Design a protein around this ligand. Structure first.
Ligand SMILES: NC(=O)C1=CN([C@@H]2O[C@H](COP(=O)(O)OP(=O)(O)OC[C@H]3O[C@@H](n4cnc5c(N)ncnc54)[C@H](OP(=O)(O)O)[C@@H]3O)[C@@H](O)[C@H]2O)C=CC1
Ligand SMILES: COc1ccc(OCCCCC(=O)O)cc1Cc1cnc(N)nc1N
Length: 206
């Protein structure tokens, strides 16, 4: 009773797997973030009555997010931090590891719970990303590929889009992406601030 649910990772990355700069993003795409929100927030209407998704993130990402947008509304927030001092993420769940976060959720949101969990997302940190990619329940990646080798100092842990991983990670069709997400999603290349990018969904068998 601590694994009956697969994990989905969401991230925006450059063609050289760059995902961050000085504890922040070296780019600024309001539409991209709008996509992030939709994806992590969406829950089938019928289930939306008492079900919510979960966003798991590292402490650094939690701090790197503006207060005005924290905590992520309409979603259950859980911050991963290995030395459990104190947080502050208003009733915001705290966990010292990925599995510790899962167990806390399954115990905090069980059958007697008026609030049920729908989907569990991993959204923050290159460090957390490393743990997720090694986790046996991580089978899906919502990736936003940025076609620009922007200078970054932090990188994604595994080259899922490269040949060496082509037998494990596969890129789904757009139709299947919109289907999993729940609604229609912009197809093709998008140009926001001199940058070209597009949405892709990748999966691997567990
Ligand atoms: N391009 C994108 O989509 C995204 C980019 N980013 C970027 O990633 C960079 C920050 O990366 P990074 O520092 O790694 O961020 P993290 O958020 O992962 O920060 C790591 C800290 O979080 C905790 N943590 C992470 N993984 C674990 C674990 N497995 N077990 C226990 N604690 C863990 C620890 O907390 P403590 O120190 O409290 O113990 C650790 O110090 C930035 O540039 C940021 O913007 C972030 C999200 C998305
Ligand atoms: C560090 O990357 C992010 C920066 C801001 C951000 O907004 C969160 C609050 C406002 C929108 C909302 O309410 O959801 C979210 C992220 C993480 C992120 C962005 N894009 C993609 N493709 N993956 C992510 N993990």
């Amino acid at each position: 009773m601590n694994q009956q649910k697969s994990l989905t990772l969401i991230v925006a990355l450059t063609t050289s797997y760059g995902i961050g700069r000085s504890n922040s993003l070296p780019w600024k795409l309001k539409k991209e973030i709008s996509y992030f929100k939709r994806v992590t927030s969406f829950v089938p209407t019928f289930d939306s009555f008492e079900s919510m998704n979960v966003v798991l993130m590292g402490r650094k990402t939690w701090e790197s997010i503006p207060l005005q947008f924290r905590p992520l509304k309409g979603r259950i927030n859980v911050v991963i931090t290995r030395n459990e001092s104190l947080d502050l993420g208003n009733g915001i769940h705290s966990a010292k590891s990925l599995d510790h976060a899962l167990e806390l959720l399954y115990r905090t949101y069980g059958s007697e719970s008026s609030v049920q969990i729908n989907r569990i997302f991993v959204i923050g940190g290159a460090q957390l990303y490393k743990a997720a990619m090694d986790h046996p329940k991580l089978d899906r990646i919502m990736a936003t590929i940025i076609y620009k080798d922007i200078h970054c100092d932090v990188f994604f842990p595994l080259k899922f889009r490269d040949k060496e991983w082509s037998s494990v990670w596969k890129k789904e069709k757009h139709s299947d992406l919109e289907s999993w997400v729940g609604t229609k999603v912009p197809h093709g290349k998008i140009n926001e601030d001199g940058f070209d990018y597009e949405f892709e969904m990748w999966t691997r068998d567990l």
